[PDB]
Structures are given as C-alpha cells and as structure tokens.
Nucleic acid binder design. Structure first.
Ligand SMILES: Nc1ncnc2c1ncn2[C@@H]1O[C@H](COP(=O)(O)OP(=O)(O)OP(=O)(O)O)[C@@H](O)[C@H]1O
Lengths: 230, 308, 425, 148
RNA sequence: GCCGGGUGAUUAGCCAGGCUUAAAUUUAUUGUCCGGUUUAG
C-alpha cells in the first residue's frame, strides 16, 4: 500500500509486482489520459481477471469445544458429517469471523470487523487465549490472517495480524477506481435462523453493488428488499 | 563496582553523568524503511553519544553471562552456514516463529535472571543499568521500558535471557531423535521418524509458559516440509542429496551478468554489486569460481576481479 | 493580553496549586473571566464544496445581520443546514469531552461521477482568537479516506468547560435554528394534549419543535407560582420548617431503606428536589434575583411585538392555568388567536426563554451573545408588519448575530446595501 | 426459582418459625409504607401470601423437594450424556449449571438439539405438575398433545 | 501412471530447448544507517 524505488531481484510475474509497478508509474504521470491507456494497467487487469478465489486451509486452536486442529478445504465442494455436539457450527462461525474483516476493509480502509465473544473461549483451567488462522491463495499470491482474544482476567496481551488483508483489499479498491464496471467477490452465510423469514422503505430508488456488503449474514429484511428489487 | 568504571573511562563529572542518566531513554530517532514488496518497517536508533557507551557496557558483561551453544545469532565465529549444517541430513522439517519478540523483554524480567545467576550488584548499578539499555516510547509519564532493536546491546541481552528455554528444550528433543536450533526468534526442528513432529507444538507452549512468561507463539507462521517439496533454512536451499546450495535462478542470473560483462555492457554500479554477490556465493558453495573459470577462461575472470 | 496567554498560566497554576479557595481567589481566574465576559461571538466566512447540489461556494458573513436574497436552483436552505452541521459539534463537546456530533450521510454527496468526497469548512473569530473547522466525508469504496479535524473546536470548548467547573452561574453561547415547519408546531395551540429548570435542558437540540412550546407553558406557570409565593412573603420560619419537612421526608426514605425500583427512583427524585430547594435557599440568602421583574419582562416583550393587545395575565382560575389576552374589550385564549399572531407569539416566547435560561446572573439577561438562523422571515405577515420586523429584532436583541433569507421587496427595501448578498446562477 | 426457594425453607427446614418471620415481614412492610405506593402495596400483599405458609400447612409426601427431584430426574432421562443439573446463586442472580464429562456448562452454550428437547420436556412436565395438585404422581393426568 | 520439487551442461544467456534424480494431503526466500559472518581497499 505504498510506493518503492522498485526493487528488482530476480525476474518474475507476481501480481504484487504489477501492483507496485503501477504505483511507481503513478507518482510521475499526472494526466489521466495516459494512465487509462498505460500497459501496466492492462497487465494488472488481465492478471486480476484470471485469478480464482479460493480459501486454502484453516486452523482452530482452543475455540469453543475444539482444542486444536487443522482442516484443508477443497476448491469446489466439501461436506462435514457428524452428530450433535461435535462442533459442526463452530467451523462455519470461524470462517465467517475471518471473512468479515475482508468484507469490512473493502468499503473503507482501517475499519474494524468482528471480534471474539468472551463466552466463546474454552472453559478449561489451563487455557489462556483463543486463536483462529487462515490462508487465501489467488493463483500464485498467498495471504494469511490471524484473529485472537485473551481470556478475561489475564494480564498478558495479544494482538491481531492485519497486513495481508489490507494489502489485498487495496488492490480491489485501486482496480475499481480505474474500471467502470469492475466485479467483486461474493461472500454469504445461511445460518439456521433462516426459517424465521419463511414468509413471516421510504421509496427506495437508487440501487448499487455496495448494498450487498452491509452484512455477511442473511437475516430478516433481505427478503423484503428482494421483492422491491424484483 | 560498575558506575565508577564507566565514569572513569569517559572522564565524566558528577553533574554531567547525572544529567545524562535521567534523559538517556528519549535519545532515540524513529524512522521508516522500505519493504521488499509493498509496505514499510519501523526502526528506532539512538544517537552517537549513547552508542559508544552502550558498546563499552556490553564488553564488561560479555565474559560474565552464559549463553547456550544452540543459539547461532550474534555470536563470534558463527553464521548461517553452521546453522544449516545441523539439518542437512534429515527428512522432515518443522519451523515456528514468535510474536513481537523484541518488545516483550522488560527490566522486570531482566533483573530476575540476574538475581538467579548468583551475581550480587549494588542498587546504584541497578539504577544505571535500568536507565541506559532501555527505551521509553510515548509520553514522559508512560513508565514503560522496552529493549527495542537497532541498539548495540539488545541482541546480546536476548540470548542471555532465553538460556533456560534453550536448555530445557534441547535435552527434551535429544531423547526423541529431534534436532533443534534457534536463530533470533526462529526455531527449527528436524527428524527422520514419521509422525513424531505433531506433538512438539504443545511442548514448546508449555515450556514457554513455564520459563519465560509474557512471550507467545505466532500461529500463522508454522510450516511442515519433507523431501518432496522446497526445503531451506534461513536462506540456503537443501538439495535432496544433502548438499547446500544457493539456487538455480541466481546461478543463471550471475552467468548472464558475466556474459553481458564480456561484451562490455555493464555499468560500474553493477560491477560492484555482482562482485559482492559472487563473493558470497563462493563462500557458500566453495567451487563457484572454478566453474566460472572453466567457462569464460581465467584471463577474463582475473581482469573482472581486478577492475576497480 | 490574549485569552490564550491567560489560559496557559491558569493551566500551570491549577497544576501546581491545590487549594481550591486560593484558585478561586487567584488573579488569573479574574482576568480570564473578565476577558471571556466581553467577546463577541462571530462567524467570519464559510465555504461549501460538493455538498448536496452546490459545487463550489465561498461566502463571508457580516457581524450583525446578513440577508440572503436571490433565488436559485440549489436552494437557500442548504446553506442554513450546512451551518447547522458545523454548529452541532460545538455544543456536544461542551456537554462532555470527545462527544460525537452530526456526521455527513453518504446519501447527500454529489451524484456526479467527477466528485469523490464532500467537505465544509468555517472559521470563528473571538476578538483576536481564531479557530477553524473542516468536516468531510468520502464516497463508499474510495481509494483514500478523509477525516475531520477537531483540535480547534475541542480547544475552544475546554475554556468553557473549565469556567463552569470553577466559577458558577456562568453563561454559554446561544445557537438556534427556526425552520419552515414552525407553522405546524406553533399552530398546535388548540389542544396538543421540570420543577428545577437547569441550564443544560435547552442545550439538547438546535431546531425548534412542539415540545419547546409545551415546555414554555410549564416554565411560565412555574415562574408565576414562584413569583406569587415570593411576593406573598411566606414566613422565613415557615420556609425553614419546609426544609425540616424535606429532612423529615429524607428520614422517611431512610426508614424505607431500613425496612423496590420505583421506591428507589422516587427517593432519588425527592433527594434531587431537596438539593434543588437547598440551592434555592442559598440563593435566597443573597437576596436572589427578582422573579417578578423577569416575569414582567417576558410578558412585556411579547406585548411589544403585538401592539393591539392591552395586557396578558395567566389567570389560572384554579385547574392548571388558562392564559387570556385582552383584545379591545374581549378576552381570548391562545387557541382562539389568528394564524399570523401565533407565529410571532411562539418565536418571541422561545427566544426570550432561551436567553433567560442560558444567561443567568447578568442584570439584564436579554443582552446575551449568540447566533440565530431563521428562514422565511415573511411568513403570514401583512405588508404593514413586514417593514418593522427588522427594527424590533435588531433593537430588542442588539448583541445577537442574525442570518436571514428573505423573499419580498418590502423587507429588502428597509435593509441597507452592505448587508445583502445576491446569489446568481 | 420459586420451587427451589420453597424447597429449602420447607423440606430442608433452616427457617425456624417461617410463619412468624413472614408475618413480621408483612408488618415491617406495612410500617415502612406508613412511614411507588402501588409497588409497596403489592409487596405487602406478597408478604401476606408468604405469611400464609402456615395457612397452607401440608408437608406431605409431595413436598417441594419431591417435586424438584421428580422434575430433574425426568429431564435427565432424555439427556443421557449429562450427569447432573443444578441451580447456582451468585452475583445476586441465579444460573443453571450442567455437567458434561468433566466440564461445567451454562445454558447458553448448549447446541440446538439439546435445547429443543430441554424446552419441550420442561414445559410438558410444567403443565401437568401445575394443573393436577392432588395426584401422588402428578405425571398421571389426562389430555391430548399435538406435535408437528 | 499423472502432477509438483532438486539442478551440471547447453544458449548475442535472467530466454529457450536437452540429460539425471526425489516422494504420508504438508515452504509461499524475509529488515538498514545497528549486531555478528564473507570479500576487498
Ligand atoms: N465454552 C465452551 N466450553 C466447552 N464446551 C463448549 C463451549 N461452548 C460450547 N461447547 C460445546 O459445544 C457443543 C456444541 O457445539 P456445536 O453447536 O458447534 O455443535 P453441533 O451440535 O454440531 O452444531 P449445530 O447443531 O449448531 O449445527 C456442546 O455440546 C458444548 O459442550
């Protein structure tokens, strides 16, 4: 999210390098006519289009009933099978938690997301904190994120890691700044509370693509807006 | 007596030394440095007057504080090459990393280790030590001191601090056929037995809590590797045969640079840059210059070396 | 001596000295009070950038009166509410430090593709002191984010907070805004169907509302009863027996405790009433103010604005009250009045109340400082009344800055040429 | 909560002259009211109702403790995994504590499956225990239940 | 079998095309002006 003297090293074609080459070219040229036709913007757009969104792996430590485990998810479909009380909803909650910070940073930078509730930490005596880790791999590019919370009453501090998701969100905002109809990824969550909306606004006029980023969860009023949209 | 030696060596009077004592923590400069990629880093470095006294201080405590032999950082006659020679003949490797290692050392934990070693020091020397090797960020009423990095005395202090952790973990790893080594805030394990490396994450956490409270493990920088993937230890690649290497990409890059130099298309800056890189690679491998000589001839190599 | 210099030395003295009596008697406090006492609140200029429909506009405001004539598509009201947004931040910080205010909503930024953010800035001059404030907000999904700067406003609000914290009976600036809906709220006179009037009650909203007039009636009743009881000269021994009755009620509350959310709430309210009564007794020891004089003045100004009516009396007639006005040889209540007279009655009865509550102590509390924003000055007024309204507003309240938008030539002719700003497309 | 309160006072004693104490509480409430009013009157009526403990005077086999045991043992049959359920008083409030394996659990932290059974069975036993005040085993009444 | 890693050697050489070899689902080469290590003057 900054400009550099373009360190060279060995030659490669990573998306990060194209991102920083466009930023380097930004500081010299001022006229937007040259910018809109520069080959660096074409390279960045072409690289961004062919990448496919994919969550690689996830690890849960000392969260709810789960003590420690790592999961690898397939790129098209994965199914979890178990009985009652085996932490099926815990995994989905963890994924939505780590996906909310990426949701928040796209609308506006340095905006907070979702934290860990104080009753979600394990009830064992020997525990001190809880953590969640993740990884996102778009083509060659890899990012990571860690969310953690210390047990109430302790006197030792732990903080979050947020450099990767902020760097990734900046690329999307920059691309959207120079493209008329740039697309965005889709994130959704259908919890068990969707049966309440089973058939149970000041003349809305303007429709945009940023209204679907208000929340990561489908609840309550989203049915009403569907009728208005239809 | 320690304050007398420092006063006598620098011929400081009573008033001057006292004036420096209570203003020493704030003589730091904070600046940013570029990152390889995108971003920036934060550094804080003292002034010239405080640096040459910090270096003098570390000379007195060097022969009095024991340091474990499994730490391969900021040590005389030790480098990366000696670090990678331990794991050069094992199959499975696991790597871990701490979280904000340098700002978790405080005078509260520093003086506790000093008391345990059996060395008794006066209260005046305690005051001098507390107000000289530590940094105070924030306002003047923060009353919080952190060791920091970029100061001449921090690297040595960290090694002495983690002596108990090194000793308690080394003999546990020895009993199970596991190799262990630490570089700054990196810890590496390696072994040949299958399914034995999945238990050490809980052990390191237990020893971490038992010996040095406050420290914690970053859980997003843990790596498992084998012989079917890329293996390297702090920047040196391990051939599956079991030999150290620099990498094929750099070998081809240096060959291209020399070939272009043979046509006289290399600027003066790149001559110095490539000469330094070649010297480092020659030290790492030991037979790089022979290969270059057998390709471009001894005369061209000698002329290139003698240039400048 | 600038008030900033008097500020810094008081800060140092307060940090060093600890005796409250010494701080009260300190020379620095007297100098600060004297400097703050005479300082005409004044807005110098304001600029608007991509707000609502305005693209760019820079305007300078006069210190006594300014008329915004000249119709245009962008609408005069937008300027008034733009100033209202800026003024909203000062009172919130005055009530408590770091209190937020009114943000710019994302649905008012300009819809043209060129723009990316909106900003409003303004400057306040207090004698020689100068403060500036900028409020900004960027569109959703922008590459760069913009934040407001509130160092100047927070600094200005600190001296007001400190003065009230040390000295007592201090006065705070007046800010009001009368929109075009006052016709409906004021017209609710027909049916439309507290004891300790503090200072911060009015420091809650800036826009006139129905509840303001509802509060006005109760305030008038409280002032009438208090003045009548003081005029009757109730026995001082009886007043002390009333204080002993409040102590007896506190004893009964203690008995209730030594036996209940409703009971606790009632006991807390009774204790607050007892504390207010004790404060009133302390003021009465120093002869207090003149209740009859203030009750006379508030009626007198209204009668000044309606020359036909002879007199106004509360004439409670038991029950609660029933205000009666004598037109000629007839008596009519406010529900029987005309549409034109109601607006004047509510406007003047609201401004007078605000100056009475906001500025106690001062011998004539009608000479306060502040800024008033009023829109559509010529609503429901015949031409005879239109040529005299400015003279009376600028004569009854000579120290209040006025911003007015006009529509008719009758108002325009009376005003001078240095106070008229014409907006053209 | 009311069941547990009567359970400790009546079955477990630890109250001495409960009727006399409750009557003195009613008198104290009246004295306090004499020297929010509706709430005080309601409190006085509640104290009189509690003072009617000797007026009731049954102390039979179907006492408060027997009902408490029957309700808990009935619930535990549908949740074989758990060990015991207890009511805990702390911080001027009551909470329900469950035992699973070797870990203590609250009520908010259960899953949806055990929440459904806990609610359904508890309400079913509450209606029978409340509409049949004379059966030796009140889970023996008559009626009709519809489940979807 | 397939895929993904190691790299001595070739080429107006960070290309390109050849010959070997390695395996539980399991690396993505990082911070200078301080510290120690390599080289040189
Ligand atoms: N703080 C906690 N400490 C210990 N165990 C906990 C804690 N919070 C929850 N649990 C355990 O979580 C279990 C239920 O977890 P979870 O709801 O994820 O599973 P599930 O029944 O598969 O999910 P769902 O029915 O919601 O799809 C409970 O049996 C409980 O023991």
């Amino acid at each position: 999210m900054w400009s550099h003297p373009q360190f060279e090293k060995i030659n490669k074609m990573n998306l990060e390098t194209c991102y920083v080459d466009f930023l380097e070219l930004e500081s010299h040229v001022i006229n937007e006519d040259y910018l809109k036709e520069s080959v660096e913007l074409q390279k960045l757009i072409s690289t961004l289009n062919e990448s496919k969104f994919h969550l690689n792996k996830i690890g849960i430590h000392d969260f709810k009933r789960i003590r420690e485990l790592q999961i690898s998810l397939e790129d098209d479909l994965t199914v979890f099978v178990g009985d009652n009380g085996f932490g099926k909803s815990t995994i989905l909650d963890a994924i939505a938690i780590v996906l909310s910070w990426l949701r928040s940073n796209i609308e506006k930078e340095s905006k907070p997301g979702t934290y860990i509730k104080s009753h979600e930490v394990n009830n064992s005596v020997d525990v001190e904190y809880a953590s969640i880790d993740a990884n996102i791999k778009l083509k060659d590019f890899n990012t990571s994120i860690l969310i953690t919370k210390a047990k109430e009453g302790a006197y030792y501090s732990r903080n979050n890691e947020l450099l990767g998701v902020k760097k990734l969100a900046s690329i999307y905002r920059l691309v959207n700044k120079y493209v008329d109809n740039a697309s965005l990824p889709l994130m959704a969550y259908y919890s068990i509370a969707r049966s309440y909306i089973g058939g149970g606004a000041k003349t809305k006029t303007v429709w945009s693509k940023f209204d679907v980023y208000d929340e990561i969860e489908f609840d309550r009023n989203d049915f009403t807006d569907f009728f208005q949209w239809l | 007596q320690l304050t007398s030696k420092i006063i006598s060596k620098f011929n400081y009077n009573r008033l001057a030394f006292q004036l420096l004592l209570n203003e020493a923590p704030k003589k730091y400069k904070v600046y940013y440095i570029p990152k390889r990629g995108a971003g920036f880093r934060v550094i804080a470095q003292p002034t010239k007057e405080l640096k040459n006294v910090q270096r003098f201080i570390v000379s007195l405590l060097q022969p009095k504080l024991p340091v474990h032999h499994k730490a391969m950082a900021y040590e005389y006659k030790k480098s990366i090459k000696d670090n990678a020679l331990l794991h050069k003949d094992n199959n499975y490797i696991l790597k871990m990393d701490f979280q904000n290692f340098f700002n978790k050392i405080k005078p509260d934990i520093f003086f506790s280790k000093l008391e345990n070693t059996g060395l008794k020091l006066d209260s005046f020397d305690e005051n001098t030590l507390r107000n000289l090797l530590f940094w105070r960020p924030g306002k003047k009423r923060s009353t919080t001191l952190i060791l920091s990095v970029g100061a001449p005395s921090s690297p040595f202090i960290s090694n002495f601090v983690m002596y108990d952790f090194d000793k308690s973990l080394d003999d546990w790893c020895r009993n199970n056929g596991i190799t262990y080594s630490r570089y700054a805030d990196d810890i590496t394990f390696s072994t040949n037995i299958k399914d034995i490396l999945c238990r050490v994450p809980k052990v390191v956490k237990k020893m971490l809590s038992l010996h040095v409270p406050g420290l914690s493990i970053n859980e997003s920088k843990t790596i498992f590797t084998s012989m079917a993937h890329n293996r390297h230890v702090t920047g040196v690649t391990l051939t599956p045969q079991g030999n150290l290497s620099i990498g094929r990409d750099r070998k081809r890059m240096l060959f291209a640079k020399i070939h272009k130099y043979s046509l006289g298309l290399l600027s003066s800056e790149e001559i110095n840059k490539t000469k330094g890189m070649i010297a480092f690679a020659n030290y790492l491998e030991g037979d790089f210059l022979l290969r270059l000589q057998k390709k471009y001839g001894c005369e061209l190599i000698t002329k290139f070396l003698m240039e400048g | 001596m600038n008030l900033e210099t008097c500020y810094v030395d008081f800060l140092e003295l307060e940090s060093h000295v600890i005796n409250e009596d010494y701080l009260k008697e300190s020379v620095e406090l007297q100098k600060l009070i004297s400097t703050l006492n005479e300082s005409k609140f004044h807005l110098n200029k304001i600029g608007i950038h991509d707000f609502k429909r305005i693209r760019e506009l820079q305007i300078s405001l006069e210190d006594d009166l300014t008329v915004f004539v000249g119709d245009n598509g962008f609408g005069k009201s937008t300027i008034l509410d733009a100033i209202a947004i800026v003024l909203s931040w000062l009172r919130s910080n005055i009530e408590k430090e770091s209190k937020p205010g009114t943000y710019i909503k994302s649905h008012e930024v300009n819809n043209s593709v060129d723009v990316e953010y909106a900003s409003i800035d303004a400057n306040i001059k207090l004698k020689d002191f100068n403060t500036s404030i900028l409020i900004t907000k960027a569109k959703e999904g922008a590459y760069y984010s913009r934040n407001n700067e509130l160092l100047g406003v927070k600094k200005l609000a600190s001296i007001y907070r400190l003065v009230n914290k040390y000295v007592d009976n201090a006065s705070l600036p007046l800010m009001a805004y009368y929109s075009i809906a006052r016709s409906y709220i004021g017209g609710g006179v027909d049916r439309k169907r507290k004891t300790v009037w503090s200072k911060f009650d009015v420091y809650d909203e800036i826009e006139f509302d129905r509840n303001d007039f509802t509060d006005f009636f109760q305030w008038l009743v409280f002032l009438h009863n208090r003045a009548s009881q003081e005029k009757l000269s109730e026995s001082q021994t009886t007043i002390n027996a009333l204080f002993s009755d409040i102590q007896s009620l506190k004893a009964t509350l203690t008995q209730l405790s030594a036996i209940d959310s409703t009971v606790i709430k009632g006991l807390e309210l009774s204790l607050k009433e007892k504390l207010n009564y004790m404060k009133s007794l302390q003021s009465g020891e120093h002869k207090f103010n003149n209740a009859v004089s203030l009750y006379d003045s508030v009626i007198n100004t209204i009668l000044k604005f309606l020359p036909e009516f002879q007199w106004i009396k509360l004439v409670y007639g038991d029950d609660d009250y029933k205000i009666i006005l004598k037109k000629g040889e007839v008596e009519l209540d406010i529900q029987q009045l005309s549409q034109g007279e109601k607006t004047i009655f509510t406007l003047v009865g609201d401004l007078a109340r605000r100056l009475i509550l906001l500025n106690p102590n001062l011998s004539n509390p009608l000479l306060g400082y502040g800024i008033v924003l009023i829109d559509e000055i010529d609503l429901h007024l015949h031409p005879q009344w239109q040529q005299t309204i400015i003279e009376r507003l600028t004569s009854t309240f000579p120290n209040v800055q006025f911003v007015i938008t006009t529509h008719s030539p009758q108002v325009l002719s009376t005003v001078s040429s240095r106070s008229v700003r014409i907006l053209q497309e």
